[PDB]
Every structure is written in C-alpha cells, then in structure tokens.
C-alpha cells in the first residue's frame with residue numbers, strides 16, 4: 106500500500122543500532138568466539154524489533170514470523186557485518202571496537218572470513234547505497250524461509266509475503282531509477298544485488314554448520330526462544 | 339560470446355541442454371536409494387561438463403576458473419534439473435523417468451526427507467510461476483557462473499571476474515527479453531526477474547544441505563575433487 110519512498114523511509118527508520126563488543130585489558134584470540142557470540146546474542150534482540158517494523162511482517166501469524174526469523178537470523182547478522190565493513194578493505198568490522206583482518210581470523214572460520222571479505226569487496230565495487238542495503242536485508246527476512254513452511258491460512262500467508270517481496274522489488278527499481286540509471290542498468294543492477302543473496306545464504310549455512318558442531322545447548326536460537334522474543338505484550 | 343543477441347543466447351542454451359538419463363536398475367528385480375542416486379549423478383556430471391562448455395562465455399575462462407565454478411555449482415545444477423523435470427508431477431520427484439518417488443520414499447536415507455520436502459516445495463513454486471523452458475536454461479546458466487564467483491587480486495583474475503559479470507548481465511538482459519516477448523509489463527518484468535533469482539538462494543541452501551550429507555559419508559570418491567573435474571574439463 107505504501108509508495109516506494111514511503112517504503113525506504115520506513116526501512117531506514119527501522120534500522121537497528123551498531124552495538125559494541127570486552128575490557129581494554131590484553132587481547133587474546135581464544136576469546137574470539139566468546140566475543141562474537143555475546144555480540145550476536147545482543148544484536149538479535151534488536152533484530153526482532155527491526156523485523157516487526159518491516160512492512161507486512163507483523164501481518165503474518167506469530168508462527169510464520171518465528172519461522173522466517175529462524176531461517177534468516179544469521180544471514181541478517183552477516184549482511185550487517187559485510188555492510189559496515191564495506192569501507193574497511195581487508196578487514197571485518199564486527200563492532201567499532203572490534204576490527205579484525207584475515208590473519209586474526211585464523212583463531213577454527215578463516216574460510217567464512219574470506220567469504221565475508223569478498224562480499225564486502227563486491228559491495229564496495231558496486232557502490233552499494235544505504236537505501237539499497239535496507240531493501241536487501243528486508244528481502245532476506247521475507248525470502249529465506251518462505252519455501253519451508255497446505256492450509257488456506259498458509260496459502261494466504263505465502264501470497265502476502267510474495268506481494269511484499271514484489272513491493273520491495275519495485276522500491277529497489279525506483280531507487281535505481283531515481284539515481285539516473287537506464288532501464289537496462291536497472292535490471293542488471295537488480296540482478297547483481299539479488300545474486301549476492303545466494304552467497305550470503307551460503308556463508309550463513311557454513312556458519313550454522315560450525316554453531317551446530319559446537320554441541321552447546323543454546324548456541325542456535327530455539328523456536329521457543331524466538332517465539333518468546335516475538336510474542337510481546 | 340558477449341555479442342550474441344538475446345534470441346541467439348536462448349537458442350544457444352537450448353541447444354546445449356543435456357539429456358535426461360535413466361536410473362540403472364533391473365526393473366524385473368524387486369524394489370539402495372543412495373546407490374541409485376549416486377550412480378545417476380555421476381553419469382549426469384559427465385554430461386554437465388559438456389553442457390558447461392557450451393554455455394557462452396564459460397570456455398573463455400581459464401581451466402582453473404572453470405573447475406572452480408563447476409566445483410561450487412555442480413550439485414546446485416543437478417538439483418535445479420531435478421526440480422525442473424519434477425514440475426509437472428505434484429508431490430513427487432522425477433529423479434529419472436524410471437525413478438519417480440513421493441514424500442515417504444525419501445525416508446530411506448538419513449536427512450533426505452528434509453531435502454526431499456525442500457525440493458518438492460521448489461517444484462511447487464516453479465509450477466505456480468509457470469516457469470518456462472527458456473527461463474529455466476537461463477537460470478541454470480546463472481547458477482554455473484555466479485555460485486563460485488565470490489571465491490583474488492591478480493590482474494588476470496580481475497579480468498576473469500569482470501568477464502563473468504558481463505556474461506551474467508547478458509543472461510539478465512536475455513531473461514528480461516523473454517518476459518517482454520511474452521507481453522509482460524515493465525513492472526511484471528522486474529518483479530518476475532526478482533522472483534526467479536530469489537529461488538536461486540533456496541537452491542543454494544538445498545545444495546549445502548546435500549553437500550553436508552555427502553561429506554558426512556566417509557567415502558573417498560563421493561565428492562568430486564578438483565583434479566577429477568580438471569581431468570574431465572581438460
């Protein structure tokens with residue numbers, strides 16, 4: 106129902122803050138997973154607030170909202186990381202007080218590290234804009250779990266998600282058209298942006314693989330935990 | 339290769355299409371699932387290599403970069419093919435014309451039922467979208483070129499990446515042309531382009547789940563090595 110410009114402003118308004126990591130005591134590479142886990146768990150609370158502010162998301166059932174977040178949360182964390190690392194070549198800006206390069210990633214993730222750095226590089230080359238970024242993040246939330254939900258309710262939920270996804274596509278095209286791009290450039294850029302999302306899913310899968318391999322009780326946010334965070338009064 | 343028309347690009351991809359293979363099993367014999375699928379895939383991979391070489395722009399790359407792209411994309415390519423020929427068979431996966439299974443038949447293998455349902459959902463989405471053959475071959479070409487392009491600073495590799503992105507742009511223009519030829523409005527054009535490309539994210543996910551299982555098997559030959567792929571390409 107909203108216009109493209111109304112859509113962008115809504116997404117920009119809903120943006121989560123950049124959080125910080127740790128005492129200015131000596132640094133050690135052993136505590137790296139500790140720092141990143143603490144940060145992530147903290148961001149995830151804010152991500153829930155952001156999601157409820159993505160247009161169309163709260164129109165879904167509580168169950169489907171959880172399913173979408175369950176599928177997308179690490180992808181969302183990762184595109185956020187890649188975004189704030191964009192203007193810091195060769196480094197990943199996990200937090201403003203936690204900026205690491207390749208060699209420091211070797212602490213058992215250097216594979217994922219290199220993949221994130223390459224995505225940052227790609228964003229840099231494409232001159233990715235903030236307005237485009239918030240659209241892509243919204244798309245990840247809506248798309249990542251939409252294929253893994255019969256009932257009439259489900260069919261209506263799926264149709265709604267696809268209609269919102271169509272709206273974000275229109276918004277992306279409008280941003281490019283505002284920027285002065287030709288129709289050919291618009292289509293080509295849209296495609297370039299969406300193809301990156303495949304790589305972000307890949308990195309998320311690799312990351313989730315490690316998280317499950319840790320064999321710890323809450324390393325992956327449970328359905329029940331996500332439900333409680335979403336199901337607010 | 340970067341000078342073809344949209345129609346020339348399409349006819350090139352359609353002519354390059356690999357054949358549908360059959361499962362190897364005695365049909366007179368009683369009703370091994372992983373054994374059947376592994377044999378099918380291995381035979382399919384040989385034809386996939388011939389196909390890759392006829393994708394415009396691919397052979398312009400170094401043999402090293404060709405192997406890397408195929409390394410990243412081969413199971414994705416097998417899966418989108420599986421989804422495509424399963425499209426007109428709701429609730430079933432058509433692994434081969436003599437091997438059509440439903441939901442409960444994937445339970446024979448650990449974790450397969452998860453993948454099974456994800457594949458069925460993709461075929462359903464394809465059917466809903468009324469995906470066209472010409473669109474399909476474009477999507478499969480995109481998978482080949484895009485999946486490995488993010489995994490360099492050497493002048494040559496900068497040239498290689500540049501080339502891959504120019505080819506991907508050409509396929510994008512081709513997709514748009516197909517849709518414009520079918521009378522879609524500009525809005526419906528870019529909306530459909532987005533819908534199709536977003537499905538490729540789910541296909542990556544399914545490949546990753548599948549790769550996790552193949553690796554979980556402690557077999558030396560199950561995952562095709564760089565050398566094996568280089569032998570086949572070169």
Ligand SMILES: CC/C(=C(\c1ccc(O)cc1)c1ccc(OCCN(C)C)cc1)c1ccccc1
Nearest residue numbers: 141142144145182183186312315323324325326
């Ligand atoms: C790439 C960094 C990422 C972490 C991360 C990414 C982005 C960001 O903004 C913050 C952190 C990461 C690490 C741990 C983690 O699991 C903790 C989750 N809770 C839910 C138990 C999540 C992300 C990571 C994921 C898997 C393995 C190693 C590292």
Ligand SMILES: CC/C(=C(\c1ccc(O)cc1)c1ccc(OCCN(C)C)cc1)c1ccccc1
Nearest residue numbers: 375376378379416417420548551559560561562
């Ligand atoms: C989803 C079916 C797929 C098989 C398949 C995919 C596409 C196709 O057209 C036909 C069958 C499959 C299974 C194993 C496999 O690896 C074999 C090892 N070779 C590659 C050395 C490839 C495909 C599969 C992948 C992982 C585990 C179980 C099944």
